[PDB]
């Protein structure tokens, strides 16, 4: 039954028992229920009035932290001879590339959230002259819209795409993207295929497609080359979460799938998640005096 | 229903799924000494959960030649945990006891143990005029073995021992026995090192038998002191 | 002791489980040391192509 | 969620999630111990309580361990399970752990 | 402080303290006794 | 009137005919931990008179070259009587203390002792970067001697030590000092073997002197734990 | 008895006394009480209505001033050949390194406060080209979280750690950290050992561990080297304080302990805190006309 | 001015004028007379 829980539960004092037919420490794991044995039933307890808050494990607080989702470096230079990100890049938006954010999200089967996006830009001179205060354009290109082909192509005129223009000397650029799934929640895992034929992608719900992020430098090239790094941070907010999952144990291999190998030896090997001890009777950090 | 039992005392708990009710000796329950029966005028210590908890003794092997086993109370517990420490530092003690005896076997085994709590089990020696000595009586946690269980080592009889608080473990029926002992003494308190109120006796009136492959069949004793009080604090005899 | 007849297996298993009770509280969020990456994942570069 | 109590060499995969018990010919014998440090690598780490707690730094409150016996119906036995509060070495004898 | 027109722009909602752990801890059709459970 | 005092706790009593009132540290009195401050959920043992009684330490000789003496609490009592036994078997302890310091001399003697209870007396070492080791800190019942009482062995000063709960024994005026210490910790309970809440310090700011025939002038410390509670029962560390 | 005190006390006029059995100038220091002699009892006084406020000695005002807690300089350069803080540093957070803040805090045994943190950054060219407007990342790494190993390691993706990104041209970066002790107050002094064995640290309460501050430059290196200095300031606020202590007299030796040596001669020598005068009858600054 | 959600973010609290110096100046069990004090 649903109830409002702001603090951890109190403990009541308890007496000696010795009641026939009452065995609160016995349980039946086969039912699939977790043990209902209370501490007051296992031991004699005192009264404790418990004031510890539980707000820091709220799902909103657990997930609504800004985390790196994308990082791209490209040369800001005259590109006429290059073969390369020619003062712009395109990124196909995903949550799977950086493992710390990926593992937290993959604790759940379904998520509904709005995404707070922070864009941080940094510049370095190619191997010094000072650093230019460049203007950047980020443009969101939804599904079926055309991506830019050049730094100066007319796609950047952004008649109906959302664009943000920001300087390097500004605070990081920030926007919110709404929850935009064609379903009521994102499918964090998808035991299915994307297309009506048999060759479609396994494991990616088509319903969750966000689109492309296109970032250009708006300035014409200078006489000298710079390296520009763009970092994108996502913070989920207004979160609903359904069906908690076993956490990832083996290292991630791919953004595209759940494939696994394990580490070569424990911990987090395929044959042994926990590191070994000499025996089930060995206490590894035993206090001795 | 009354084949399942849970006992909770202090930080300890025992469950059995094959009880045969349980015995409250003479229909009494343990209690603290009331003011209208008290003698020693100092304020008692009542450690509660530090003492009033199950202590498990060393198990004994049930073998076809066994005569049976005994433990004296408080002697068997006088060196165990915080009960032992309170015993060693106090002139006077008082408590009840909760006794739980455990023995399981297969559905192909047979055998019956009489589990009997005897008050003032003053032992006799066999075939001598000399009274039993201190080392014959004071066995501690290990307990003793019956010399002549047929006469309870006291020239009386096993046959009439059912006049004392008892249960049976009949391997076909049950795997545990429980007896609750009140304080049982002529004085309201006693010196714990020189007098035993109760003797637990476990006697195999029907021997263990089977035609399956043999296993070790142990008997295990768990005892919880109940409503412990101690008076006359001094240095530990220990 | 563990006591079994001849036709049972002479060796038996326990499974141990753990959970928190509802008096349990956690505080001060941190990066979990359980996961890490030494390099880009496979196909992470291909998201830029 | 299951503890990885048998985190030993020569336990592979699923074998690490169960502890095997045999008939003994000596009384009062030790069967296994469980390291209780959730931060250091041990039987508790890869558990639901363990994994979620490792996103946090501070913790409070009681734990429950449940054990399921998976012998045959004809198998009988009694075990004692002991928790020792900290300060000394892990007990190696039953009459110590019993306290 | 939220002067934006769309409500999804607002700051995070850290106020929902409703819990029902029994949907994960006790998803049994018959609720268990605090008699033996089977 | 307030030059005479009797203290009665458990089976122990002390009388003095030459007190100088007594100190209650920060105006507090010892108390048990209330339910709205408690953390550990197990039921505590509260031994009362078994623990809450005066223990007398070994006396120290007041000599013209003395630098002064210190004892750490609970360390100095962790091996004494039933307080020591409860300490050794429990993870957590809590108590106040009653401290009574005794020193008498003739009407021809002079000398003054500062008797000060210091909370969290974290010691420094002299003339090294290496922190004090375990054997420098944990002296037990014997206690320690000040290396540099002028800076309290902590680089602060004796002169300002009167900010702590204190009395003086000025031999012309009084022969005893009494300080009542509440529980003084950031946590509601603590592990008794790794942290000391209080240090008793006795420092001879005015040296002992006379022109009578010399006698041994001892200083004696008696300490009563007050409202002792223990949590987390296990085997004895001991 | 507790009372509200906003101003210093008034003085009442007083007459001549000569009362038998009444001796307000006599006291008994042995009790441990401070003298209760009032000025009106020692001398004939006038009436003075006293308007002097006492707010500047409030413990909140006394301690809630921003003070330097950490100062680190490191080279911002291409580090491929260096042996050094390679565009980032790690700091183990403590209050003991700068003596002015340390001595004020050590006037108390227990403190509870939230910490207002100000991060000030400055840059100089290595031995001139102008100064770059770099972006920095500070990341708080709590106990048991992994610290970054490189300027560009994936730990900086900060999925659940709090990070602040700030420019050199910005105002100093500022955040508040809550009171985060596992006890109800910090132990400013700790007469105890950190571990259950005997070899643990003396003098540091494990309950007070804050964690690590990790600061990187986010920009790639320029063709030329710069020296970057980061200064961290802490201001305690919302302060409760318990058990006042004798102030430190001898110079501090170590951040790790209370060890002492003294100055070689007075003042603040181990044998003589106050500087000498020729005799107890010598007046050192005696007015003569 | 405090628009942050957590209350520990607020500016300093310089308003608590309660004092009780007698817990340091006169921690004696019997309060002293303003008769001789012993
Ligand atoms: C558990 O997760 C499964 C569900 N899931 C949600 C997302 C997601 C949704 C919306 N956005 C995202 C983003 N945002 C980049 C961005 C977009 C538009 C912008 O617009 C400006 C150019 C005006 C700026 C930046 C970066 C990374 C991920 C997302 C991905 N998967
Ligand atoms: C009497 O004193 C004993 C108690 N005591 C309190 C503190 C303390 C607490 C919290 N903080 C501190 C800090 N803060 C650095 C900081 C942390 C996180 C940051 O987060 C950003 C990266 C997002 C930024 C800076 C610097 C120095 C000290 C502290 C230390 N000892």
Count CA atoms closer than 13 A to C9's CA, side-chain side: 10
The CA distance from A229 to B50, in Å, is 66
* Residue B70 near residue B151, CB atoms below 8 Å: no
* Residue F210 near residue F172, CB atoms below 8 Å: no
The CA distance from A174 to A237, in Å, is 14
* 8 Å CB contact of D57 and G160: no
CB within 8 A of A144, min separation 6: which ones? none
Q: Is A117 in the pocket of ligand 1 (CB under 6 A)?
A: yes
Determine the Cα angle at C23 with ends C21 and C25, to 5°.
100
Q: Is G111 in the pocket of ligand 2 (CB under 6 A)?
A: yes
Count CA atoms closer than 13 A to G138's CA, side-chain side: 22
* 8 Å CB contact of F131 and G190: no
3-state secondary structure of F130: coil
| Cα G41 → chain centroid | 41
* Angstrom distances, CA of residue B167 to CA of A267, B19, B179: 53, 10, 8
Nearest CA to F141 out of F86, F39, F222 is that of F222
* Residue B76 near residue B201, CB atoms below 8 Å: no
Nearest CA to C17 out of A120, A35, A14 is that of A35
3-state secondary structure of F181: strand
The CA distance from G202 to F125, in Å, is 12
Place of tokens 């004994």: B60
CB within 8 A of B84, min separation 6: which ones? B77, B78
The CA distance from F30 to H23, in Å, is 15
Residue B16 belongs to domain spanning: 1-237
Query: What is the number of H-type helices and E-type strands within chain D?
Result: 2, 3
| Rg (alpha carbons) of chain F, rounded to whole number | 18
The CA distance from F50 to A96, in Å, is 64
H8 and chain E: CB distance < 8 Å anywhere? no
Six-digit token string for D94 = 């039953």
For residue A103, give the H/E element and its range: helix A99-105
G281: left (phi over 0), alpha (psi -120 to 50) or beta: alpha
* Residue F231 near residue D87, CB atoms below 8 Å: no
| Cα F236 → chain centroid | 25
Give per-residue burial for B21-40: e unless 16+ CB within 10 Å, then b.
ebbbbeeeebebbeeeeeee
CB within 8 A of F226, min separation 6: which ones? F9, F30, F52, F95, F96, F97, F98, F180
**Shortest Cα distance, chain A CAs vs residue B212, angstroms:** 30
User: Regarding beta strands B5-9 and F5-9, do their DSSP bridges make them parallel or antiparallel, or are they unpaired?
Assistant: unpaired
Nearest CA to A269 out of D13, G244, B108 is that of D13
H35 and chain F: CB distance < 8 Å anywhere? no
* Angstrom distances, CA of residue H34 to CA of B199, G36, G62, G240: 71, 7, 33, 32
The CA distance from G200 to G204, in Å, is 10
Q: How many residues are given for chain F?
A: 238
Per the structure, how many domains does chain F have? Answer: 1
Nearest CA to F40 out of F233, F235, F238 is that of F233
The CA distance from F178 to F198, in Å, is 15
* Residue B18 near residue A51, CB atoms below 8 Å: no
Q: Which ligand is nearest to the CA of G138?
A: 2
Q: Which of A67, A169, A288 sits opposite G169 (nearest CB)?
A: A169
The CA distance from F18 to F52, in Å, is 24
* 8 Å CB contact of H8 and G26: no
The CA distance from A41 to B13, in Å, is 9
* Residue B139 near residue B79, CB atoms below 8 Å: no
Peptide bond into G132 cis (omega under 30): no
3-state secondary structure of G39: helix
**Shortest Cα distance, chain A CAs vs residue F220, angstroms:** 32
Six-digit token string for B198 = 């109760």
* Residue F194 near residue F146, CB atoms below 8 Å: no
3-state secondary structure of G81: coil
Q: Which burial class, exposed, middle or buried, applies to B165 when counting CB atoms under 10 A from its CB (0-12, 13-18, 19+)?
A: buried
Ligand 2 atom 14 nearest Cα: G117
Give per-residue burial for F182-210: e unless 16+ CB within 10 Å, then b.
bbbbbbbbbbbbbbbbbbbbbbbbeebeb
The CA distance from G188 to G101, in Å, is 12
Handedness of CA A142, A144, A147, A153 (dihedral sign): negative
H3 and chain G: CB distance < 8 Å anywhere? no
Tell which atom from ligand 2 comes closest to the C-alpha of G161: 23
3-state secondary structure of D64: strand
CB within 8 A of A271, min separation 6: which ones? A262, D12, D13
B128 and chain E: CB distance < 8 Å anywhere? no
Chain C residues with beta carbon closer than 8 angstroms to that of D63: 18-21, 24
User: Regarding beta strands B176-181 and B23-24, do their DSSP bridges make them parallel or antiparallel, or are they unpaired?
Assistant: parallel
Phi (first) and psi of residue A257, to 5 degrees: -155, 175
F44 and chain A: CB distance < 8 Å anywhere? yes
Peptide bond into F148 cis (omega under 30): no
Nearest CA to F234 out of G93, D97, D12 is that of D97
Count CA atoms closer than 13 A to F198's CA, side-chain side: 27
Six-digit token string for G32 = 């441990």
* Residue A239 near residue A109, CB atoms below 8 Å: no
The CA distance from G220 to A75, in Å, is 12
Distance from the alpha carbon of residue A151 to the mean position of ligand 1, in angstroms: 22
Distance from the alpha carbon of residue G212 to the mean position of ligand 2, in angstroms: 9
Count CA atoms closer than 13 A to B58's CA, side-chain side: 15
The CA distance from G208 to G188, in Å, is 9
| Among B residues 152-181, those touching chain A with beta carbons less than 8 Å apart | 180
* Residue G32 near residue G77, CB atoms below 8 Å: no
Strands (E) across chain F are located at 5-9, 12-16, 23-24, 55-56, 60-62, 69-73, 90-102, 110-119, 144-145, 166-170, 176-181, 198-209, 217-233
Six-digit token string for F104 = 């008498």
Nearest CA to F143 out of F58, F52, F53, F205 is that of F58
* 8 Å CB contact of A284 and D35: yes
3-state secondary structure of B150: helix
Instruction: Count interface pairs B-F at CB distance under 8 A.
Output: 32
Six-digit token string for F56 = 């007398």
Q: Is A91 in the pocket of ligand 1 (CB under 6 A)?
A: no
Peptide bond into F43 cis (omega under 30): no
Nearest CA to F232 out of F39, F93, F91, F88 is that of F91
Q: After which residues is chain H broken (C to N over 2.5 A)?
A: 34
The CA distance from B113 to B158, in Å, is 12
* Residue D28 near residue B218, CB atoms below 8 Å: no
The CA distance from B114 to B205, in Å, is 7
Can you give the CATH number for the domain in which F57 is found? 2.60.120.20
Strands (E) across G59-146 are located at 67-76, 88-92, 108-125, 135-141
| Cα F62 → chain centroid | 18
3-state secondary structure of D26: coil
Phi (first) and psi of residue D50, to 5 degrees: -60, -55
* Residue B177 near residue B101, CB atoms below 8 Å: yes
- What approach was used to elucidate this structure? cryo-EM
Touch test H–C: 3 Cβ pairs or more under 8 Å: no
The CA distance from A253 to A251, in Å, is 6
* Three-class HEC string of chain E: CCCCCCHHHCCCCCCCCEECCHHHHCCCCCCCCCCCCC
User: Regarding beta strands A3-4 and E18-19, do their DSSP bridges make them parallel or antiparallel, or are they unpaired?
Assistant: antiparallel
Q: Is G177 in the pocket of ligand 2 (CB under 6 A)?
A: yes
Resolution (A): 2.3
Distance from the alpha carbon of residue G59 to the mean position of ligand 2, in angstroms: 20
Count CB atoms within 10 A of the CB of residue A129.
Answer: 16
Count CA atoms closer than 13 A to G253's CA, side-chain side: 19
Determine the Cα angle at C36 with ends A58 and A96, to 5°.
70
3-state secondary structure of B86: helix
Nearest CA to C44 out of F221, A63, A98 is that of A98
The CA distance from D18 to C14, in Å, is 6
For residue D95, give the H/E element and its range: helix D94-97
Nearest CA to A193 out of A184, A202, A185 is that of A202
| Cα G241 → chain centroid | 13
Q: Which ligand is nearest to the CA of G115?
A: 2
């Amino acid at each position: 039954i649903e109830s409002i829980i702001k603090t951890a539960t109190d403990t009541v004092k308890s007496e000696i028992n010795a009641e026939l037919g009452v065995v609160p420490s016995l349980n039946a794991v086969e039912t699939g229920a977790t043990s209902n044995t209370e501490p007051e039933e296992a031991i004699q307890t005192r009264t404790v009035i418990n004031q510890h808050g539980v707000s820091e494990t709220l799902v909103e607080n657990f997930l609504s932290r800004a985390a790196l989702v994308s990082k791209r470096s490209f040369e800001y230079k005259d590109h006429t001879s290059s073969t390369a990100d020619k003062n712009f890049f395109k990124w196909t938006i995903n949550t799977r590339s950086f493992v710390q954010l990926r593992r937290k999200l993959e604790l759940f089967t379904y998520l509904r959230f709005d995404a707070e996006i922070t864009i941080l830009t940094t510049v370095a001179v190619n191997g010094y002259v000072g650093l230019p205060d460049l203007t950047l354009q980020a443009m969101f290109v939804p599904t079926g819209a055309l991506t830019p082909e050049k730094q100066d192509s007319f796609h950047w005129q952004s008649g109906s795409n959302a664009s943000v223009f920001f300087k390097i000397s500004d605070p990081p650029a920030r926007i919110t993207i709404p929850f935009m799934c064609i379903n009521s929640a994102y499918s964090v895992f998808y035991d299915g295929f994307a297309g009506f034929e048999k060759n479609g992608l396994y494991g990616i719900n088509p319903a969750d497609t966000i689109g492309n992020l296109c970032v250009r430098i708006v300035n014409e090239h200078q006489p000298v080359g710079f390296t520009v790094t763009v970092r994108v941070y996502m913070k989920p907010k207004h979160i609903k979460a359904w069906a908690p999952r076993p956490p990832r144990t083996l290292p991630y291999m791919s953004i595209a799938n759940a494939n696994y190998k394990g580490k070569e030896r424990a911990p987090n090997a395929l044959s042994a998640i926990i590191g070994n001890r000499d025996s089930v009777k060995t206490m590894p950090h035993n206090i001795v005096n | 229903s009354d084949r399942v039992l849970q006992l909770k005392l202090g930080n300890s708990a025992i469950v059995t799924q094959e009880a045969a009710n349980y015995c409250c000796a003479y229909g009494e329950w343990p209690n603290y000494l009331p003011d209208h029966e008290a003698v020693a005028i100092d304020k008692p210590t009542q450690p509660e959960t530090a003492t009033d908890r199950f202590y498990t003794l060393k198990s004994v092997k049930w073998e076809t030649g066994s005569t049976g086993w005994w433990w004296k109370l408080p002697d068997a517990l006088n060196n165990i945990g915080m009960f032992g420490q309170n015993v060693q530092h106090h002139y006077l003690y008082r408590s009840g006891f909760l006794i739980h005896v455990q023995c399981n076997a297969t559905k192909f085994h047979q055998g019956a143990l009489l589990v009997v709590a005897i008050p003032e089990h003053q032992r006799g020696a066999h075939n001598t005029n000399t009274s039993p000595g201190f080392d014959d009586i004071m066995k501690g946690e290990e307990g003793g073995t019956f010399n002549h269980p047929y006469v309870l080592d006291d020239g009386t009889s096993l046959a009439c021992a059912t006049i004392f608080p008892h249960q049976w473990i009949n391997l076909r029926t049950n795997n545990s026995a429980t007896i609750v002992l009140p304080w049982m003494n002529a004085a309201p308190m006693d010196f714990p090192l020189r007098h035993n109120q109760w003797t637990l006796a476990i006697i195999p009136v029907v021997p263990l038998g089977t035609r399956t492959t043999s296993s070790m069949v142990p008997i295990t004793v768990s005892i919880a002191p109940m409503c412990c009080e101690f008076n006359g604090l001094r240095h530990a005899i220990t | 002791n563990l006591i079994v007849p001849s036709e049972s297996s002479d060796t038996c298993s326990l499974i141990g489980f753990i959970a928190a009770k509802d008096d349990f509280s956690l505080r001060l969020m941190r990066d979990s040391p359980d996961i890490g990456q030494l390099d880009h994942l496979h196909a992470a570069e291909a998201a830029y192509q | 969620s299951m503890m990885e109590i048998n985190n030993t060499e020569s336990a592979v995969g699923m074998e690490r999630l169960k502890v095997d018990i045999s008939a003994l010919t000596d009384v009062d014998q030790l069967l296994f111990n469980i390291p209780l440090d959730i931060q250091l690598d041990g039987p508790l780490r890869n558990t639901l309580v363990g994994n979620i707690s490792r996103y946090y730094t501070h913790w409070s409150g009681s734990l429950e361990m449940t054990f399921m016996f998976c012998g045959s119906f004809m198998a009988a036995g009694k075990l004692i399970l002991c928790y020792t509060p900290p300060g000394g070495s892990c007990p190696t004898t039953r009459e110590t752990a019993m306290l | 402080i939220n002067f934006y027109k769309d409500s999804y722009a607002a700051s995070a909602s850290k106020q929902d303290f409703s819990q029902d752990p029994s949907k994960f801890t006790e998803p049994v059709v018959e609720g268990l006794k605090a008699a033996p459970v089977l």
